[PDB]
Ligand binder design. Structure first.
Ligand SMILES: O[C@@H]1[C@@H](O)[C@H](O[C@@H]2CO[C@@H](O[C@@H]3CO[C@H](O)[C@H](O)[C@H]3O)[C@H](O)[C@H]2O)OC[C@H]1O
Length: 324
């Protein structure tokens, strides 16, 4: 049972940016405590899995939008905005995209993979626009997800192998052409550490924007840990923001490295407070902050963990109180 009378989390940040959460379509019923926590605390929603490539086009031409639409319907019913996650990734993407259809033992050509990418992107964006029109809550999409490797080079996924380095620019071109009203993001993890990957993201976006690629923002996943350095996060935000793009914190959670003790929860509260003070200070750049999961019991991180503001019993944790 949730605490109904404590402050609605997103309301605390009304003068800064929307506060969202990634959800599962099976946790949206009015009688479900997870759905109650969702509607109470967040004014933005993201599909944790239902809008990924495999979740939308499992086999070629066979589009499965029911779960995604259930989430969109819920966002509309609760006056929430949404982020679309994600049009291209190297995980949760079906193998058929990369296979020659006449000989599945061989790879698709650059032109065929690009055509499939264009058809996927266009169908996905046209689906939400035609079904929901002006009521479409989605304000932007993670057009590409995790395209850098941890050394800062382009990740050598099948997209890169088959097409080459311009597959990123093409994804953005296709998305922009399908729906120019959507803000287009490049999303990634570890770019908040002010290391080689942060520099590579800055370099890549600088390059693509100078070439006219329609990138509107950079999504910083923010899968931080109890040991993360706030100074590095501030420096990363400032560096990426210098490109003149929006910054969104897209998948925030805190890895406790196995320590879920009361002492650790207090340390987590101090760190989350510092993190949100930083986000508020950078409000001129940050346009959304989204948590990757509603409560600890439904977090994607393996156990034991305590990554979010609501615990495994759906109760507000010390970090929630520290922030509000
Ligand atoms: O077995 C499969 C699971 O492994 C899968 O788990 C999801 C994996 O993707 C996570 O979201 C990513 C978290 O990291 C970054 O933020 C990415 O951008 C996200 O996409 C989900 O949280 C997990 O639920 O689910 C499907 C199942 O078949």
């Amino acid at each position: 049972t949730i605490q109904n009378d404590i402050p609605d989390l997103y309301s605390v940040f009304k003068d800064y940016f929307p506060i969202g959460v990634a959800v599962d379509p099976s946790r949206l019923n009015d009688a479900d405590p997870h759905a109650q926590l969702t509607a109470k605390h967040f004014n933005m929603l993201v599909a944790e899995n239902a809008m990924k490539p495999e979740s939308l086009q499992p086999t070629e031409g066979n589009f499965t939008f029911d779960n995604a639409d259930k989430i969109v319907d819920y966002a509309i019913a609760h006056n929430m905005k949404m982020r679309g996650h994600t049009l291209l990734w190297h995980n949760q993407v079906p193998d058929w995209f990369f296979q020659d259809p006449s000989d599945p033992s061989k790879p698709a050509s650059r032109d065929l993979l690009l055509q499939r990418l264009r058809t996927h992107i266009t169908t996905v964006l046209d689906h939400f626009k035609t079904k929901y029109g002006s009521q479409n809550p989605i304000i932007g999409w993670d057009v590409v997800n995790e395209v850098l490797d941890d050394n800062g080079n382009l990740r050598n996924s099948k997209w890169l192998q088959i097409i080459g380095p311009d597959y990123i620019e093409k994804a953005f071109e296709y998305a922009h052409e399908a729906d120019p009203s959507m803000k287009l993001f490049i999303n990634d993890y570890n770019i908040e550490n002010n290391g080689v990957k942060t520099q590579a993201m800055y370099d890549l976006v600088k390059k693509l924007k100078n070439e006219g690629v329609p990138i509107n923002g950079i999504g910083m996943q923010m899968h931080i840990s109890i040991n993360s350095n706030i100074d590095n996060i501030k420096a990363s935000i400032e560096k990426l923001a210098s490109l003149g793009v929006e910054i969104q914190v897209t998948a925030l959670d805190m890895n406790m490295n196995g320590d879920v003790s009361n002492d650790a929860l207090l340390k987590q509260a101090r760190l989350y407070k510092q993190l949100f003070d930083l986000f508020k200070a950078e409000k001129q750049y940050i346009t959304a902050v989204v948590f990757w999961g509603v409560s600890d019991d439904v977090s994607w991180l393996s156990k034991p963990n305590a990554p979010l503001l609501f615990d495994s019993k759906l109760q507000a944790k010390p970090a929630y109180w520290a922030i509000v």
